[PDB]
From a paper:
Glutathione transferases (GSTs) constitute a superfamily of enzymes (EC 2.5.1.18) involved in the metabolism of endogenous and exogenous molecules, widely distributed in nature. They are bisubstratic enzymes mostly known for conjugating GSH to electrophilic molecules, thus increasing their hydrophilicity and facilitating their elimination from the body. Cytosolic GSTs are dimeric enzymes that bear a GSH-binding site (a conserved site known as the G-site) and a binding site for an often-hydrophobic cosubstrate (H-site), in each monomer. Our work shows for the first time that at least two cytosolic hGSTs from different classes, hGST M1-1 and hGST A4-4, catalyze the reaction between NO2-OA and GSH.
To overcome this pitfall, we prepared the GS-10-NO2-OA adduct by mixing a limiting concentration of 10-NO2-OA with excess GSH. hGST M1-1 was crystallized in the presence of the GS-10-NO2-OA adduct and the structure was solved at 2.55 Å resolution. With two dimers in the asymmetric unit, the refined structure displayed the typical features of hGST M1-1, including a conserved N-terminal thioredoxin-like domain (G-site) with typical βαβαββα topology and a C-terminal all-α domain (H-site). Indeed, the GS-10-NO2-OA adduct was bound within the active sites of the four chains within the asymmetric unit, all exhibiting the same binding pose. The electron density map suggested a (R,S) configuration for carbon 20 and carbon 31, respectively, in the four chains of the two homodimers. The glutathionyl portion of the adduct was strongly bound to the protein by many interactions, including several H-bonds and salt bridges, engaging residues Y7, W8, L13, W46, K50, N59, L60, Q72, S73, and D106' (from the other monomer, not shown in the figure). The OH group of Y7, a key residue for catalysis, was at H-bonding distance (3.0 Å) from the sulfur of GS-10-NO2-OA. The fatty acid portion comprising the carbon with the bound nitro group (carbon 31) and the methyl terminus sat in close proximity to the hydrophobic H-site containing nonpolar residues M109, M113, and F209. From the opposite side to Y7, another tyrosine (Y116, on the C-terminal tip of α4) established a 3.3 Å H-bond to one of the oxygens of the fatty acid nitro group. A higher mobility was observed for the carboxylate compared to the rest of the structure, as evidenced by a weaker electron density, as well as higher atomic displacement factors (or B factors). Finally, the crystal structure of hGST M1-1 also suggested that, as there is a fixed and conserved site for GSH binding and a very well-defined site to accommodate and interact with the nitro group, the enzyme can probably only bind and catalyze the reaction using the (E)-isomer of NO2-OA leading to the formation of the product with (R,S) configuration at the chiral carbons 20 and 31, that was observed herein.
Author numbering:
A (entry chain B), B (entry chain A): 2 to 218
The structure:
Amino acid sequence: PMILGYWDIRGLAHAIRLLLEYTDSSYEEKKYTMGDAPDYDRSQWLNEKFKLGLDFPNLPYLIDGAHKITQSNAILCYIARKHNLCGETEEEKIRVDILENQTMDNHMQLGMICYNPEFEKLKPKYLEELPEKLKLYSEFLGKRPWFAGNKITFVDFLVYDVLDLHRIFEPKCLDAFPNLKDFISRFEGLEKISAYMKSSRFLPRPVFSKMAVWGNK
Amino acid sequence: PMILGYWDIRGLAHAIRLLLEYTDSSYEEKKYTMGDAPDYDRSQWLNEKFKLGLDFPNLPYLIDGAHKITQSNAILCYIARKHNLCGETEEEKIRVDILENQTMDNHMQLGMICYNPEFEKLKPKYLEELPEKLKLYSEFLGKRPWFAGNKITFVDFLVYDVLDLHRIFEPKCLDAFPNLKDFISRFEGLEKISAYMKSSRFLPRPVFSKMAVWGNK
Ligand SMILES: CCCCCCCC[C@@H]([C@@H](CCCCCCCC(=O)O)SC[C@H](NC(=O)CC[C@H](N)C(=O)O)C(=O)NCC(=O)O)[N+](=O)[O-]
Ligand SMILES: CCCCCCCC[C@@H]([C@@H](CCCCCCCC(=O)O)SC[C@H](NC(=O)CC[C@H](N)C(=O)O)C(=O)NCC(=O)O)[N+](=O)[O-]
């Protein structure tokens, strides 16, 4: 069994958890609990942070035998390589590469306003730009069933996560993009994905850690 | 010829420029000049931002025939795929994947304190953590000639950019890590890399855009 180590939140591990479930990967989760305010005790993680053999210790981390991987996108790429979910044509690889980085940027942008204490002042400005960001995703997808082409790749798990987070934040934001709504439906309708969302292992909340102004609970 | 579009600064294009030079890639650069304070006029880019056919318009961008790529890591991966600089074994790919993301995180951390107006208050705290960060790179490299193994990969260009920026910021930071200094020497000693650094095309400064508190000039 692989070990997925991360906080007891959704955060950056959501797509890793979904990709593990979809690939029928045998795994165990090591969950770290963060303390409440004002200290936000990370001692549970910080004590074993340098005792795991990680090259650049960080959460999330995946231990799969001899391989100890950090960086959420690197963990996703590792799992996707085992089950051929990386794209085959050069066009597919370009789409995967762009999206892997683009979704990270969109997740960071949301996370920055959510972790800022002036979240209430920044929120309306973020909401004005949100339709423009979502429009790029709607357009890039187009008539395709999946984001890289006709086959599902790990970037579909990343795009789904960004779309789901924005629908948690602003529920009406996907209403203008029918193909984005259809993509969420198609992704959630996958047999393993559907089973995992009904199970007890499913952890859709909290969206961020206890230190966030939005999504801490 | 491929077209590399980016601001007239070093920024996120430094490793792309170096990788293009090392691979003997035929390319042209489209440089966008940002205006001075307080407006910081990005009209040169904003006018043709939606007229290039880019799926997710951004700087840097690479146009190579039918392929229009955005996201610096995606551009690097595209070029590296053409010249087999992505890693062959699974161990090498894991190293490349970790580093591609890890170097992006280190670049973002330096960029966040350099774009913050309280740069002078944040700088000493960032300098206390810097030895710990550099130690991880020194330990990950070990006795290897390159970061992924014995062969040079595109992540060596990314790591070099991170190390070089930190030595521009605090010059004595690499003195404690002899193998990191040796890596810089070995990377800069490559025939194409050495030739490009002596040429007029070389753009090592400004480190960041005009809006940055540090590295704007
Ligand atoms: C606020 C920072 C910018 C927005 C971040 C958006 C995503 C947030 C993530 C993260 C929360 C970040 C908190 C920032 C500081 C908040 C306090 C303030 O406000 O100063 S969780 C994972 C986080 N690891 C990474 O960030 C390594 C990311 C790497 N590229 C990857 O993808 O693996 C962690 O817990 N590390 C433990 C450790 O270092 O030992 N999450 O989901 O909670
Ligand atoms: C705010 C934290 C600091 C930014 C992170 C540090 C790296 C900086 C980069 C950047 C400068 C940004 C600085 C912002 C500052 C704000 C200030 C304030 O409003 O408060 S490159 C230029 C930038 N490109 C990206 O961001 C593409 C990133 C992508 N993940 C990749 O890897 O392609 C751009 O302009 N693109 C055209 C567009 O606008 O769409 N650089 O090297 O100059």
